[PDB]
Design a protein around this ligand. Structure first.
Ligand SMILES: *[C@@H]1O[C@H](CO)[C@@H](O[C@@H]2O[C@H](CO)[C@@H](O)[C@H](O)[C@H]2NC(C)=O)[C@H](O)[C@H]1NC(C)=O
Ligand SMILES: *[C@@H]1O[C@H](CO)[C@@H](O[C@@H]2O[C@H](CO)[C@@H](O)[C@H](O)[C@H]2NC(C)=O)[C@H](O)[C@H]1NC(C)=O
Ligand SMILES: *[C@@H]1O[C@H](CO)[C@@H](O[C@@H]2O[C@H](CO)[C@@H](O)[C@H](O)[C@H]2NC(C)=O)[C@H](O)[C@H]1NC(C)=O
Ligand SMILES: *[C@@H]1O[C@H](CO)[C@@H](O[C@@H]2O[C@H](CO)[C@@H](O)[C@H](O)[C@H]2NC(C)=O)[C@H](O)[C@H]1NC(C)=O
Ligand SMILES: *[C@@H]1O[C@H](CO)[C@@H](O[C@@H]2O[C@H](CO)[C@@H](O)[C@H](O)[C@H]2NC(C)=O)[C@H](O)[C@H]1NC(C)=O
Ligand SMILES: *[C@@H]1O[C@H](CO)[C@@H](O[C@@H]2O[C@H](CO)[C@@H](O)[C@H](O)[C@H]2NC(C)=O)[C@H](O)[C@H]1NC(C)=O
Ligand SMILES: CCCCC/C=C\C/C=C\CCCCCCCC(=O)O
Ligand SMILES: CC(=O)N[C@@H]1[C@@H](O)[C@H](O)[C@@H](CO)O[C@H]1O
Ligand SMILES: CC(=O)N[C@@H]1[C@@H](O)[C@H](O)[C@@H](CO)O[C@H]1O
Ligand SMILES: *[C@@H]1O[C@H](CO)[C@@H](O)[C@H](O)[C@H]1NC(C)=O
Ligand SMILES: *[C@@H]1O[C@H](CO)[C@@H](O)[C@H](O)[C@H]1NC(C)=O
Ligand SMILES: *[C@@H]1O[C@H](CO)[C@@H](O)[C@H](O)[C@H]1NC(C)=O
Ligand SMILES: *[C@@H]1O[C@H](CO)[C@@H](O)[C@H](O)[C@H]1NC(C)=O
Ligand SMILES: *[C@@H]1O[C@H](CO)[C@@H](O)[C@H](O)[C@H]1NC(C)=O
Ligand SMILES: *[C@@H]1O[C@H](CO)[C@@H](O)[C@H](O)[C@H]1NC(C)=O
Ligand SMILES: *[C@@H]1O[C@H](CO)[C@@H](O)[C@H](O)[C@H]1NC(C)=O
Ligand SMILES: *[C@@H]1O[C@H](CO)[C@@H](O)[C@H](O)[C@H]1NC(C)=O
Ligand SMILES: *[C@@H]1O[C@H](CO)[C@@H](O)[C@H](O)[C@H]1NC(C)=O
Lengths: 436, 255, 427, 183, 49, 49
């Protein structure tokens, strides 16, 4: 990241290399600023979760949150977490980032029965009462809620132990992300507490249901289970935290042209933003799913590139140790805006600009060259399109020297004119030589 | 009026990103090609069919082709349990919470409600043994909820959790509508985005229904053929989708 | 006969560190668990591109043509070669690409990247479906290198080869160069394969017309019914397919929770993101290694085809080839070569007999009074109805002279004639 | 590319099995050892594929060397550009590491001149008696024969001409006749 | 590599010993012990000098 | 090669998708099935090359 020569040396993994034109990776591009743009929505309302009667696991309560801004720092102070089991997320990841939906399923459940909700369990509680989805990033937490928060437990807290129907006694299991059917609920709500399999007939089909209660396993620090499932759908993000990220700036006009880390609508990445002229959507994608632009809140369209995007080639000769840069397929009037992304000496050359450096060729903008008319037959420093680089005759210890540009003349063979008559012309050798 | 994949009939647009000029292979809820659906006709000469006796299975979801290939909107009743009414043996009773989609006014205002349907003990009402059927019968803003007025003469609607209203502008062209239930609730899809040919279903509402819907009935209507809408089921099918320049699905392949 | 030979592979350099990791330090630290991968990929791609340019330089060294006749509007005389001649010597611009080269390039969908201001264009225009492969160079992290020689220089080499076709191969050795006209070279080539000078002088306008129709039938020859045109198109499509395989692989999660490092870092703790980034890194390394292996195989194929094109040029364009089937069907007369996308396009004209007749011929003729004096024909037969001479490539019964016979040893199979002796057999 | 990727961990905690075994429990070391096995298996498969493609290229080059030995070092080539530029005179082959080294000696002109030549000469008294050069040209001074690879005019004799059918392009000569054309 | 440099050099030397012959006249069955200078002069004569 | 590399477990508990689905829970099914998928993709890619 000091020179283009040092970036050429760090790639290819050696110091003593031969002459040639090499493709060079970047080593001095770091994110400087930070940008954050997200929509503001009215706050999510979590009163039903913590300030009402605790739901029963047989008929648990589900609430789906959409187009609201939450605050996890307040929610975690009202509970004492005993154990959290997250699938493809973390609570630190739940405190950040935008979702399309936020589903919370909560019910009252004793803390001694964690094994009955673990994945792979074969008990009646998973089979007939609550089956977790496990197809979206979800985290199930076990918490104790104080009675001073507003939670309460009353009535009977029961769970279905068996629910089968029909003449073949087919078990009415619970699909993942589902609840017990209304037939099982109606059979349970008349079923005895002790756990006797009574028989009923709902809608012409025999049904049998048994239940058991756990209302005597609940105390004043009421044990509660909160299952939080999020969904990710880019271009449809609605639930984001009230807290804006701390470093970030909310104005992009002073960060244009520099590699910044952006958190625009729950997605994180690094890139360079530049204003460009070219709306059924906010983000703009290419054919290969790479965001190439976005529409801002004001009237402006910033097309975003990756942090490194300009192809850089280094022309180097092992004798005299000189080097030069080739910015491939890019105009010379655009390099001075993207400078911060190059090496330190190249950045120091483009800032405080001297236009002697930048020459525009048919293969891109070159640096460290001078225009010449001399042509060479051998081409060891080919730039393509019949251009060869003529290395200087001064070594690097005496100071940097410029390369020569434009070479590869035609052989121009000897011309014999046709008489176009009865006779013709022949080109015969007077002298000869032997070549091997 | 069968499903045609080359016209992309009944395909649901993927939620979120707008795809453009690429082909996409998805396996998601889609109408099966060649399905004729079930034709429902509202008379206009009051005069109804027995559409309230069926209790068709909901399955994964349904899609509806409304109007041309008079444009009278459908009325729907979705629920979890289906059975007979008491003391008359007549089918059509929906137990527990029941989703109602009622096209009030002339099809310009919609009522969506999710609540119990308690029969009334009056003559020609359910539970009276004079029962035949329930139906919806068709300036200042009091008939904006007249479909609700017709449906509350037969049922009490006593404990109601969700209620919303939607404004749609009057038109006569083709239109689609779809209902899909997942773990986030009941998703209502429509093709009212009206961009270019359209005929693609986009999400526009979500009802917080967490009980599994197992049945749907078509509420009979009478205005005093003149009405034809076809209800096609949805299946978990592999499809191949073609997006055009504007970003709409033009071709489909049933795979 | 039209034949396409693909003498090259696209030169592609890939920024390995940017491709595998999107600038994240954690990914670049986890990449060190797979060794110096990026250095090896960079060295392999550099070696492949350097060998490709060396092959191109050697192939065009075999088109040296040390002497040439300058091209003029009148070339071939009655024979029409304005299709093959440079556009500079024809009407208009000083470019050397012939009308056939322009017609061949204009009828093949190339989607030129633009080596001067490709970045800037890709920035100004929005998303598309025809230039998105070109615009993926600056997003995915690769680059398509320009060819070693400009199209003007390749057209200059082809034009200099065209001007040297008639004179080369006139006599023994390659040292001299005659400046004979194209029509005389064609007539001598037709005479060498067994057509009498009497037939050539009598039927010269018919021969010129047949050659003109054969060369002018290629105006509509660049259609979907032409096999070599489809070879050009599918070579271009194969290069585009390899490029599209380089992209569209960063969109693959490879079993991770997302296709991007930033989401994995944000959504997971510090221990699980190591294995997720390892999954993504393994996917990217598999893609890069597959691309490099494919590049090596295509380089081997391009080297083989470059050797084949060198013989085709040295054997058929620069001289008449008497070996069967090497350059087209029938009897080879003259072959032309132009520049095709990533290769060379060859056109071999051939002598095809439209009609055949059957006639009794003899091995040779002896004398009854002098059985040790026998003759055999050169480049022809001794056809009956006594015996006359034919050309062995065109039916024209002509009197036997010493200009078409040779004195050979007597054989049992030779026929004996007593009256109406040929002038070779007299005395 | 075989001894270098034995030092890679391939995502495991170590590049060796001996310390993976002794640092982890029996269930947790199976995945680490399997990661090392997968990495070394991909390395070996890549090496075998590279060996196959290199053997294909070596077979192609062996066929080329077989054809080139039988044509140029064992005989006069008389083929343009196949065995060096210019006209091929003599070639030699010596052994090189993993192949053969060829040296093709060729005849190269250094200075050229342009003279006026004829397709052949005929006699005006006998139009049916016409000659042509065999390995050279009829260059004009009246007319002389020369070689096709060296400029040295010589008198026209019967050992460098051959009788041909008359044509229109043949120059008429009636003042001085070459010995083939004289009667 | 299956062969010692001695053997390979023996093959190359034997090939060098038969440069002047083995192609003096049509057919490959005969061999002429022609001096190298005479073979070179005959090859130059066949080239067109 | 194609016939025989379908019997390999590739580090999974089984060489069959059905046994992995039956024996393990849904979180581990996607982990172990991806081990079979990756091996079969490797086999097909090697065959095509
Ligand atoms: C959050 O939800 C609770 C209950 O769901 C809301 O509390 C209700 O508020 C209305 C009017 O504010 C009262 O009429 C009800 O009696 C309240 N019910 C209960 C159970 O408290 C609360 O208002 C909501 N928060 C916000 C900000 O809207
Ligand atoms: C998110 O919730 C936390 C906790 O309720 C808020 O932190 C409180 O902020 C107020 C305002 O100064 C203080 O008076 C409290 O003492 C804070 N409580 C704690 C526990 O720190 C925080 O402000 C909320 N975030 C937002 C954006 O409102
Ligand atoms: C679902 O609906 C059924 C039928 O409407 C309800 O069952 C009724 O429950 C009440 C309360 O005990 C009884 O008086 C009725 O006799 C029952 N009817 C039948 C047909 O059994 C059931 O309670 C509902 N489920 C709920 C509300 O969760
Ligand atoms: C309509 O909702 C009310 C409110 O929940 C229900 O009244 C409850 O009924 C249950 C069962 O009889 C009692 O245990 C509760 O104490 C009642 N609560 C109140 C506030 O009265 C009523 O049953 C519902 N009606 C129907 C038909 O389901
Ligand atoms: C043409 O005449 C020659 C004789 O000059 C015939 O050749 C002879 O055939 C006899 C057959 O018994 C042999 O014994 C002689 O040795 C042959 N002589 C020569 C010189 O070949 C020849 O067969 C005759 N041609 C035909 C077609 O009959
Ligand atoms: C050499 O003489 C011959 C015989 O006169 C010429 O051949 C004739 O040329 C004229 C015109 O050039 C033609 O009209 C005749 O048809 C030719 N006769 C034959 C039999 O071909 C020949 O052209 C003369 N050479 C030159 C260079 O003029
Ligand atoms: C497998 C039956 C044969 C072996 C029987 C021997 C001992 C059985 C005792 C308890 C069986 C429990 C097995 C699963 C334990 C977790 C149950 C759950 O919470 O999911
Ligand atoms: C080949 C060259 O450069 N110069 C040659 C010279 O070596 C030679 O002695 C001379 C004889 O005429 O002809 C000239
Ligand atoms: C003398 C003659 O025939 N000239 C024609 C020319 O006019 C035409 O443009 C060309 C097209 O192929 O063909 C030739
Ligand atoms: C619940 O709140 C009361 C009221 O201050 C407090 O005394 C008690 O300690 C709290 N419970 C717990 C577990 O902290
Ligand atoms: C961002 O900064 C620019 C700098 O001139 C200013 O004009 C603009 O109003 C700012 N936008 C804000 C603060 O939203
Ligand atoms: C937008 O287009 C105008 C031409 O009308 C041009 O002057 C301007 O520079 C363009 N803006 C950008 C960001 O390229
Ligand atoms: C190179 O050639 C151009 C062509 O006109 C000329 O203008 C220029 O001065 C030349 N440069 C040098 C250094 O001679
Ligand atoms: C509805 O009416 C049709 C018409 O006769 C009849 O076939 C069908 O059985 C009826 N369905 C009922 C009564 O459920
Ligand atoms: C409704 O009643 C009919 C006959 O009266 C019976 O066949 C049918 O099963 C009943 N339906 C239900 C759901 O009980
Ligand atoms: C409805 O069916 C039940 C079941 O048989 C019967 O008891 C009842 O009388 C029927 N109602 C009428 C009105 O017939
Ligand atoms: C529907 O239209 C009525 C009448 O203009 C209006 O009062 C109501 O707010 C509208 N509803 C929505 C959701 O826009
Ligand atoms: C969309 O794809 C078609 C396919 O030919 C193409 O013609 C058209 O230009 C593309 N449009 C865009 C905006 O990429």
């Amino acid at each position: 990241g000091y020179n283009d020569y040092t970036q050429l040396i760090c790639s290819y993994g050696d110091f003593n290399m031969k002459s040639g034109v090499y493709s060079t990776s970047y080593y001095s591009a770091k994110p400087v600023g930070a940008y954050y743009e997200a929509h503001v929505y009215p706050d999510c309302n979590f009163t039903e979760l913590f300030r009402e009667r605790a739901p029963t696991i047989m008929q648990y309560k589900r609430e789906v949150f959409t187009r609201c801004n939450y605050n996890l720092s307040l929610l975690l102070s009202l509970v004492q977490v005993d154990e959290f089991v997250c699938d493809k997320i973390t609570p630190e990841a739940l405190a950040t980032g935008c979702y399309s939906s936020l589903t919370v399923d909560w019910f009252a459940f004793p803390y001694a029965w964690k094994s009955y909700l673990a994945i792979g369990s074969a008990d009646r509680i998973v089979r007939f009462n609550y089956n977790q989805d496990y197809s979206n990033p979800s985290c199930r937490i076990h918490s104790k809620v104080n009675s001073s928060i507003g939670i309460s437990y009353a009535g009977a807290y029961s769970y279905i132990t068996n629910c089968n129907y029909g003449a073949t006694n087919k078990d009415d299991v619970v699909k993942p992300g589902g609840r017990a059917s209304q037939q099982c609920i109606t059979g349970a709500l008349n079923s005895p507490t002790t756990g006797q399999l009574w028989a009923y007939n709902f809608g012409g089909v025999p049904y049998r249901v048994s239940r058991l209660t756990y209302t005597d396993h609940l105390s004043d620090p009421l044990d509660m289970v909160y299952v939080i499932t999020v969904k990710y759908e880019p271009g449809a993000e609605t639930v984001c935290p009230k807290q804006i990220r701390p470093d970030y700036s909310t104005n992009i006009t002073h960060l244009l042209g520099s590699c910044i880390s952006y958190d625009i609508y729950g997605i994180t990445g690094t890139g360079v933003f530049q204003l460009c002229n070219a709306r059924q959507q906010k983000f703009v994608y290419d054919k290969f799913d790479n965001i190439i632009g976005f529409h801002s809140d004001d009237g402006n369209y910033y097309c975003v590139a990756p942090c490194v995007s300009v192809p850089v080639s280094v022309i180097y000769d092992d004798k005299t140790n000189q080097y030069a840069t080739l910015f491939g397929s890019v105009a010379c009037q655009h390099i001075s805006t993207m400078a911060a992304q190059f090496s330190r000496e190249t950045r120091a050359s483009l800032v405080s600009r001297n236009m002697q450096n930048l020459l525009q060729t048919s293969v891109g903008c070159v640096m460290g060259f001078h225009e010449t008319n001399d042509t060479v037959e051998e081409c060891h420093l080919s730039l393509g399109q019949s251009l060869c680089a003529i290395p200087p005759n001064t070594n690097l210890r005496s100071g940097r020297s410029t390369f020569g540009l434009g070479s590869l003349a035609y052989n121009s063979p000897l011309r014999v004119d046709a008489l176009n008559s009865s006779e013709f012309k022949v080109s015969l050798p007077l002298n000869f030589t032997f070549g091997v | 009026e069968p499903i045609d994949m080359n016209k992309a009939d009944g395909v649901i647009y993927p939620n979120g990103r707008t795809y453009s000029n690429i082909t996409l292979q998805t396996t998601n809820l889609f109408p099966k090609n060649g399905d004729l659906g079930t034709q429902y006709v509202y008379s206009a000469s009051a005069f109804i069919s027995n559409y309230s006796y069926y209790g068709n299975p909901f399955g994964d979801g349904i899609v509806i082709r409304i109007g041309q290939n008079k444009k009278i909107y459908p009325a729907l009743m979705l629920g979890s349990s289906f059975g007979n009414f008491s003391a008359n043996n007549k089918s059509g009773a929906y137990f527990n919470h029941t989703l109602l989609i009622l096209p009030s006014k002339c099809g310009t205002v919609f009522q969506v409600a999710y609540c119990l349907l308690q029969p009334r003990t009056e003559s020609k009402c359910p539970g009276n043994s004079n029962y035949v059927s329930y139906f919806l019968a068709d300036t200042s803003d009091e008939i904006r909820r007249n479909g609700l007025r017709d449906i509350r003469k037969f049922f009490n609607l006593v404990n109601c959790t969700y209620f919303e209203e939607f404004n749609v502008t009057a038109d006569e062209r083709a239109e689609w509508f779809g209902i899909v239930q997942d773990a986030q609730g009941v998703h209502l899809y429509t093709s009212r985005k009206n961009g270019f040919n359209s005929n693609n279903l986009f999400l526009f509402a979500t009802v917080p229904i967490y009980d599994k819907l197992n049945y749907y009935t078509v509420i009979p209507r009478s205005v005093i053929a003149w009405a034809a809408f076809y209800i096609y089921p949805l299946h978990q099918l592999s499809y191949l989708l073609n997006f055009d320049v504007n970003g709409y699905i033009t071709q489909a392949a049933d795979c | 006969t039209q034949e396409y030979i693909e003498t090259s592979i696209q030169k592609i350099t890939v920024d390995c560190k940017q491709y595998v990791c999107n600038g994240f330090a954690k990914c670049e630290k986890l990449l060190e668990q797979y060794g110096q991968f990026c250095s090896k990929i960079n060295q392999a791609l550099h070696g492949a591109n350097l060998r490709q340019d060396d092959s191109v330089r050697n192939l065009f060294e075999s088109v040296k043509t040390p002497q040439t006749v300058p091209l003029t509007t009148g070339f071939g005389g009655e024979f029409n070669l304005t299709l093959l001649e440079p556009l500079s010597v024809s009407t208009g611009s000083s470019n050397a690409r012939s009308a056939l080269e322009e017609l061949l390039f204009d009828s093949v969908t190339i989607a030129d990247p633009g080596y001067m201001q490709g970045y800037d264009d890709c920035m100004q225009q929005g998303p598309a479906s025809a230039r998105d492969l070109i615009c993926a160079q600056y997003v995915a992290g690769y680059k398509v290198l320009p060819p070693l020689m400009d199209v003007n220089m390749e057209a200059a080499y082809t034009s200099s080869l065209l001007g040297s076709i008639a004179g080369a191969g006139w006599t023994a050795g390659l040292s001299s160069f005659a400046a004979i006209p194209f029509a005389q070279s064609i007539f001598y080539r037709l005479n060498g394969v067994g057509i009498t000078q009497q037939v050539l002088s009598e039927n010269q306008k018919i021969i010129a017309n047949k050659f003109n129709q054969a060369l002018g039938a290629m105006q509509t020859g660049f259609t979907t019914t032409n096999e070599a045109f489809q070879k050009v198109q599918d070579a271009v499509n194969t290069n585009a397919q390899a490029l599209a395989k380089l992209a569209s692989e960063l969109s693959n999660t490879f079993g991770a929770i997302s296709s991007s490092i930033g989401d994995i870092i944000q959504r997971l703790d510090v221990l699980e993101q190591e294995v997720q980034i390892d999954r993504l890194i393994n996917g990217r390394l598999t893609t890069l290694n597959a691309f490099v292996a494919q590049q090596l195989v295509r380089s081997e194929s391009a080297a083989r085809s470059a050797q084949l094109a060198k013989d085709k040029v040295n054997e058929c364009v620069k001289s008449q080839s008497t070996r069967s089937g090497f350059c087209g069907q029938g009897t080879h007369i003259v072959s032309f070569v132009i520049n095709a996308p990533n290769g060379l396009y060859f056109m071999h004209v051939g002598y095809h007999p439209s009609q055949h007749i059957e006639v009794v011929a003899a091995y040779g003729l002896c004398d009854s009074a002098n059985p040790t004096n026998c003759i055999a024909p050169v480049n022809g037969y001794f056809i009956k109805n006594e015996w006359s001479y034919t050309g062995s490539s065109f039916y024209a019964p002509e009197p036997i002279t010493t200009l078409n016979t040779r004195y050979v040893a007597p054989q049992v199979t030779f026929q004996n004639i007593s009256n109406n002796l040929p002038p070779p057999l007299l005395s």
